[PDB]
Amino acid sequence: KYPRPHKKLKQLHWEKLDCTDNSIWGTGKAEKFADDLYEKGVLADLEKAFAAREIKSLASKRKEDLQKITFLSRDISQQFGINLHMYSSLSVADLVKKILNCDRDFLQTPSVVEFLSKSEIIEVSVNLARNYAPYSTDWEGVRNLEDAKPPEKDPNDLQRADQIYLQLMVNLESYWGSRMRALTVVTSYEREYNELLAKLRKVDKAVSALQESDNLRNVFNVILAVGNFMNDTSKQAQGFKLSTLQRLTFIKDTTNSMTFLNYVEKIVRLNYPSFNDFLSELEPVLDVVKVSIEQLVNDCKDFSQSIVNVERSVEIGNLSDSSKFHPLDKVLIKTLPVLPEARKKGDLLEDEVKLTIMEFESLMHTYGEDSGDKFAKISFFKKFADFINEYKKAQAQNLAAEEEERLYIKH
Amino acid sequence: KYPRPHKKLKQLHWEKLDCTDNSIWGTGKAEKFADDLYEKGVLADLEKAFAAREIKSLASKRKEDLQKITFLSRDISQQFGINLHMYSSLSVADLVKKILNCDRDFLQTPSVVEFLSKSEIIEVSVNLARNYAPYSTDWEGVRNLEDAKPPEKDPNDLQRADQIYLQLMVNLESYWGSRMRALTVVTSYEREYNELLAKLRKVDKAVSALQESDNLRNVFNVILAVGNFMNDTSKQAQGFKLSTLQRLTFIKDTTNSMTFLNYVEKIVRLNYPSFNDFLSELEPVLDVVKVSIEQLVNDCKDFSQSIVNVERSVEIGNLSDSSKFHPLDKVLIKTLPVLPEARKKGDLLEDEVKLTIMEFESLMHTYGEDSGDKFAKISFFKKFADFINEYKKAQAQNLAAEEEERLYIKH
């Protein structure tokens, strides 16, 4: 009186509530589900999905192709099946014809393209190339799968993981990397570009904000005024470096509560309120904080350079010679139509970046920082950001302290 | 040509930008500020706020009242000035008359009321009571400040921190605690109540949701159906305990990717989609997760109990006898009008809590958990919450896996 499986299944060791009492159980529903699911075949799927004993058929095939010969590490041979699991159901033949035909789904799977491009994966040691030498094929000159014919020994004796490594990383070593590098570009340039441009925009907004922040500069003049008022003649100044910002908290008042910065804020808020807008005006500076304009600029170069290199290999490199390829390999049918569009994105990007660099550096000279100094460039926005946060913390404290005093003076 | 201070001030050691060049400096503005600030007196405040040398006047008073006698630890005497800094400007006389008069600002300062109620602060060791014994006053019977007259020695010889401890924690030890306990209640019952009621509402919403979640129960029946289908006869069940929920991930399918839970989700989503509403319906269960209905219930009791105790001390305790008080002490003028309203909040709260307990426990029996078991009560909502999150994670994985397959089957 319940559907039952023909083959024994995995068990669920639940703690059963002994009886259908004054509870949520015993409404009859569960059996209706059992019946419904059964009619719809769901139970039959479950029966295969959770059979307790591995099908004898697959059991042996896996026991057999597990004793064969392998020259790959326990790690590599392992992560091979992992990263290519979506192809568990294909014969090395089809899986390989999959990667070489470059099939649309293959390319749209970012994780495999990376794995097939991994260093330790692509790089074949001298020994390994020897170990696999016996079963190796050449392909150079071969104009079709059904015309090569040089077996030299047998591949099937090799475990699946090694059969793949062989067919690609070894038999194509003469140009595997270049092939991958080529495809990785065709399959990334689009978003890499967007990403880069995204970051580049954050920088542009920050630069603009600082560039046009009269309030910020005004606060700076208030700080300068007060500063000169306190300092003796040896320390009088016409202006100050940004380092100055990070040291306005080390000075406390008599009662030792308030900080120099608190007073500045108090002075601004109660005498030149508008100046405080700079806090809002400079959110873009707070946002760009997690971006190294140094790293960004280099990323562009690498972006362009990668596209460049691929173009070389395609015109005079390991990919200029198409008879050196595997008959089934078709990187070029995919790659070539794309290069010009990728290059186009590269140029676009470069132009923007160069403009930004220009404006940024020019902004630094405005605040007396050296555009030459690597560190100075990198810490430029942090300094404004930290200051802003400090100002905020100070404004907070003053608003608090003032409220208490607004009370005490009453009572 | 710049306002200058008469008394030397603290210095700001900034790194000056050497010259007003093609930069933000040298617009003349800073000097206008210096002049403006000066006219408005701001510079004069700054002059006092950041003078480099402590005023000689205050210097001595602080050197003098720093050599006097003290029997208080380095810690206590210290945190005394800290927690009462807002009263730095008052004579021990006024500060003390401040705390005893209960002044509105004093009560509205949660931090002092707590400090004055601290254990190690209120508790006077036998030795200390002796050390201070000489300068001690009694007050019992005394009907006015200007009629006590028993000095017994001199208090002024005592450091400020000790002069306070004395005037209150010692001379009033006969009822200090009760006095504080009384005021702490008058000054907290209002928000304590709101807080408690707030938490209590979270619990009520969760209870309701689970109470009325047919979808949840339906999922449970689907799980039961499938479960019985897989299990042998020894494990057949009419229902299962919640522990069952946390063990639906330990069962994997052949390929070893999917989990039993993934299938359940798949089954629900593709056959009984509406059932999935339970995920939305039960957000209140996710929210109540950070509340121990056990702790909450006790907090009420403590809430009521505190109010009770104060009522006792007021009617027959250390606060029933008003001639035992300090002439300036007026807890009762504040306390008494309030007790009835606090008690009222206590009763209100209790009534709600008792109702909630009722419903909650009754909800547990619905899912087969023991309302008696301390742990069972405490983990009740976590179990549903964890399950919900797990279901969500599973739904996520299935949606992913399915998309990849939606691709692969195409190409």
UniProtKB/Swiss-Prot annotation, chains A, B:
Subunit record text: Homodimer, and possibly also homotetramer. Interacts with PFY1 via the FH1 domain and with actin via the FH2 domain.
The protein's name: Protein BNI1
Domain notes: The DAD domain regulates activation via by an autoinhibitory interaction with the GBD/FH3 domain. This autoinhibition is released upon competitive binding of an activated GTPase. The release of DAD allows the FH2 domain to then nucleate and elongate nonbranched actin filaments.
Places the protein is found: Cell membrane; Cell projection, Ruffle membrane; Cytoplasm, Cytoskeleton
Stated family: Belongs to the formin homology family. BNI1 subfamily.
Full-sequence range covered: 1350 to 1760 of 1953
Leftover remarks: Each FH2 dimer contains binding sites for 4 actin molecules.
Ranges for domain FH2: 1-411
